[PDB]
Design a protein around this ligand. Structure first.
Ligand SMILES: Nc1ncnc2c1ncn2[C@@H]1O[C@H](CSCC[C@H](N)C(=O)O)[C@@H](O)[C@H]1O
Ligand SMILES: [Zn+2]
Ligand SMILES: [Zn+2]
Ligand SMILES: [Zn+2]
Ligand SMILES: [Zn+2]
Ligand SMILES: [Zn+2]
Ligand SMILES: [Zn+2]
Ligand SMILES: [Zn+2]
Lengths: 428, 347, 46
């Protein structure tokens, strides 16, 4: 309401729209809104960090794009666009009579997809993908020192890498290390779900020395399993995301398991004065809490890097990566082997309407034989850059196997991250 | 036979190391750490039990040679907690010495001053180290155990205390200064923004302390969050590797995190909780769960207090209308062994 | 007895089975056992 009074005052040319927070009408303007014209307070920044990449079961956004809240949202009819604009923001930025008349417009495009681009009170700021990329470098609220850069070991002195992988899953980390041609001395992997154990056992030919639960692992185990050169892991994002209908908590269950990664990182870290190269990668999902993100950054003593897989693969897989791997910041390059269109990842005889996929109306992405159908499991493997037929090991159901594929890291993203480790360890 | 040794050594010209000075046994498991002589196996066990046991007022609980609390002689050095017994002083130092010592009332003990002529009892050199080595080789499952510091080598103790100020307690334990404006303890309420650089800027620390709040919630942040923040800032306040100086840490719980979060905490602090109750009239008034490395923290444990009774206590104390008080007296005596490591003074 | 305690410590994943002599439990592991997994001390070789 105060929002609406302030925008009323702005249309009289008495107040600048850039001097007011367009999300909630706050006067405490610190930032500028990245997509559209207006200011941006810090509470709306925290709400924007939490809510922007949240999507309903629909596939469209959980909340409004402008204020990350709202009451009733207006979903976009344009293809592959999932944005929603609540009625209260369109009462301001387009007018109090144009929302009602725009609902009646049956082919309705949203204002990020509006072919014209310019409107009266609302105009779209031009370099908005650049500002969306800069907005996560704008997260300097958590200020830290940069990760310590170790000088490279000569090529004749290099040795096979040793990896402690927590929350292994289907052994994406070891696979990506074998794709890069790095010699792996040993790969210790703690994991609980039998199916993922079985996927890793078969696809990596008994090389992985498997363990039990992460919680059972003691520092004595860490010491006695040799010095580790690379510790990798990712917290469960089944409960942490808004996509699961059963959100009883937020950091019950998953939160604990993050601290298990934290502890075994301090157990596997070499002492001060031991200047041997040691590296670590944590992974989490972007649709997370702010104070959650703060606590993670503070425990791991680092600024997260957001990496979206759209730059290299055929999915929208935006994930945080904490770590000290060299060149974690540097921009993503997609090789010619990587498929940037969904249609290339399809089987023959199938034609996709989408160019990128959202796997958790249009819930089933494929029009084959004038019929709506789910991606096949081997295609979901192709979307994330896995080798073909990667998960067809054991007699498991399709729902379980899709669920086994959907938790996994995106393979070309993890190749992009792990690639400068070749400079430090031996090759095949 | 405690009395027989005076014949055995003098007339039979026999080494003190071949007999047990603590009781008069002739079969010795090993040698006595503090003084010249052997020691037999039950006395060895008795000694290791009693080792760092003190009394509530401040002084050592048992007799420093033989671990007899029945009779006690208090030493007259304000920087010495060593208390003895009569049977030893007359048995080991000659027939009429304990009564003379008792009549002196300004008597420094053997470890204080050796200048006084001694009949048979000889003080081992370096004995602090010998004590440490004895505990190492002779304790079953030995623990994090630091050599005791000579009294002139005792510096003031540097305390970090998270979520609870312990200035009042340790000052009343004479460990902290009442006359200083530069505080020798750094209390922090909110640690949320704290970085490793910040804990390092605040200086090195000797003791780290952190505790969950009582039942009246100052804030709604869950009790696991305090534990994890403690673990982090604890890993920050650790001394740089290669440090011989004694570093300690003590986490305290006022029954406020459940069994699941308790299991998580037991894992992350790498030992099982020590429950230390307040029992009045036989009745369980209060209790507190601890984790620490402080000597003889684990022999204060009470295995009589069951988990169901602690759940009943938590239920009864949550549903009362009284404001929550910090249970000072339960963890107060759990800092007494640091007397033997750090500089005391009390006016 | 001692070797049974040793194997108990191995099944906890605190010790490798290849660092212990599975025949008699000796810590003096020079050889590996030829048929099965584990070390092999020289007395057990004889
Ligand atoms: N306590 C625990 N210990 C080990 N793995 C666990 C676990 N709890 C859950 N997990 C598993 O850890 C995974 C969480 S995320 C897995 C992603 C992984 N990088 C991959 O590419 O497969 C899930 O497979 C989940 O079943
Ligand atoms: Zn705002
Ligand atoms: Zn809105
Ligand atoms: Zn649109
Ligand atoms: Zn004896
Ligand atoms: Zn005595
Ligand atoms: Zn004395
Ligand atoms: Zn043998």
């Amino acid at each position: 309401r105060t929002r609406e009074r302030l925008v009323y005052e702005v249309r009289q040319k008495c107040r600048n729209i850039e001097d007011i927070c367009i999300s909630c009408g706050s006067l405490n303007v610190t930032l500028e809104h990245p997509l559209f014209v207006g200011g941006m307070c810090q509470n709306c920044k925290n709400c924007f960090l939490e809510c922007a990449y949240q999507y309903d079961d629909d596939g469209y956004q959980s909340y409004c794009t402008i204020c990350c809240g709202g009451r009733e949202v207006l979903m976009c009819g344009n293809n592959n666009c999932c944005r929603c604009f609540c009625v209260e923001c369109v009462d301001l930025l387009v007018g109090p009579g144009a929302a009602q008349a725009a609902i009646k417009e049956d082919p309705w495009n949203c204002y990020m997809c509006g072919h014209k681009g310019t409107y009266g009170l609302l105009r779209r700021r031009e370099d908005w993908p650049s500002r969306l990329q800069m907005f996560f470098a704008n997260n300097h609220d958590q200020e830290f020192d940069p990760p310590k850069v170790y000088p490279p070991v000569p090529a004749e002195k290099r040795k096979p890498i040793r990896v402690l992988s927590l929350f292994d899953g289907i052994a994406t980390g070891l696979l990506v290390l074998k794709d890069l041609g790095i010699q792996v001395d040993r790969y210790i992997a703690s994991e609980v779900c039998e199916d993922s154990i079985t996927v890793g056992m078969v696809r990596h030919q008994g090389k992985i020395m498997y363990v039990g639960d992460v919680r059972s692992v003691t520092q004595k185990h860490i010491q006695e399993w040799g010095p580790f050169d690379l510790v990798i892991g990712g917290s469960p994002c089944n409960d942490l995301s808004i996509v699961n209908p059963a959100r009883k908590g937020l950091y019950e269950g998953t939160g604990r398991l993050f601290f298990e990664f934290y502890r075994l990182l301090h157990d596997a870290r070499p002492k001060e004065g031991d200047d041997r190269p040691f590296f670590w990668l944590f992974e989490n999902v972007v649709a997370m809490g702010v104070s959650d993100k703060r606590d993670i950054s503070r425990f791991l003593e680092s600024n997260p890097v957001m990496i979206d897989a759209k730059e290299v693969s055929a999915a929208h897989r935006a994930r945080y990566f904490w770590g000290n791997l060299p060149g974690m910041n540097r921009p993503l390059a997609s090789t010619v082997n990587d498929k940037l269109e969904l249609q290339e990842c399809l089987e023959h005889g199938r034609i996709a309407k989408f160019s990128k996929v959202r796997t958790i109306d249009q819930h089933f992405p494929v029009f084959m034989n004038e019929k709506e159908d789910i991606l096949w499991c081997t295609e979901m493997e192709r979307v994330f850059g896995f080798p073909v037929h990667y998960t067809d090991v054991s007699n498991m159901s399709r729902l379980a196997r899709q669920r086994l594929l959907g938790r996994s890291w995106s393979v070309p993203v993890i190749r992009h991250l792990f690639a400068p480790l070749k400079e430090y360890f031996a090759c095949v | 036979g405690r009395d027989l040794i005076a014949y055995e050594v003098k007339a039979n010209q026999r080494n003190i190391e071949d007999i047990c000075i603590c009781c008069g046994s002739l079969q010795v498991h090993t040698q006595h750490p503090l003084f010249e002589g052997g020691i037999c196996a039950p006395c060895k066990d008795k000694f290791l039990d009693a080792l760092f046991l003190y009394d509530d007022d401040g002084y050592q609980s048992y007799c420093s040679i033989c671990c007899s609390g029945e009779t006690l002689l208090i030493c007259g050095n304000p920087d010495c907690t060593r208390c003895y017994c009569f049977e030893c002083v007359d048995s080991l130092v000659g027939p009429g010495t304990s009564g003379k010592v008792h009549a002196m009332s300004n008597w420094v003990c053997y470890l204080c001053l050796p200048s006084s002529r001694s009949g048979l009892l000889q003080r081992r050199r370096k004995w602090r180290s010998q004590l440490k080595a004895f505990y190492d080789r002779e304790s079953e499952n030995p623990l994090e155990m630091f050599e005791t510091v000579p009294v002139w080598r005792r510096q003031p103790v540097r305390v970090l205390s998270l979520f609870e100020d312990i200035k009042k307690e340790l000052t009343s334990l004479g460990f902290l200064e009442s006359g200083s404006d530069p505080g020798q303890l750094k209390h922090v309420v909110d640690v949320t923004d704290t970085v490793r650089k910040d804990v390092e800027e605040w200086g090195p620390f000797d003791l780290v302390y952190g505790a969950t709040p009582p039942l009246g919630h100052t804030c709604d942040r869950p009790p696991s969050w305090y534990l994890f923040q403690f673990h982090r800032l604890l890993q920050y306040a650790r001394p740089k590797p290669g440090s011989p100086g004694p570093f300690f840490w003590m986490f305290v719980d006022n029954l406020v995190l459940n069994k699941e979060d308790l299991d998580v905490a037991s894992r992350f602090l790498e030992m099982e909780p020590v429950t230390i109750p307040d029992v009045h009239g036989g009745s369980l008034q209060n209790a507190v769960r601890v984790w620490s490395n402080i000597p003889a923290i684990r022999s204060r444990h009470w295995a009589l207090v069951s988990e169901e009774e602690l759940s009943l206590l938590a239920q009864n104390k949550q549903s009362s209308k009284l404001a929550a008080k910090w249970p000072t007296k339960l963890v107060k005596n759990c800092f007494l062994p640091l007397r033997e490591y750090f500089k005391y003074f009390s006016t």
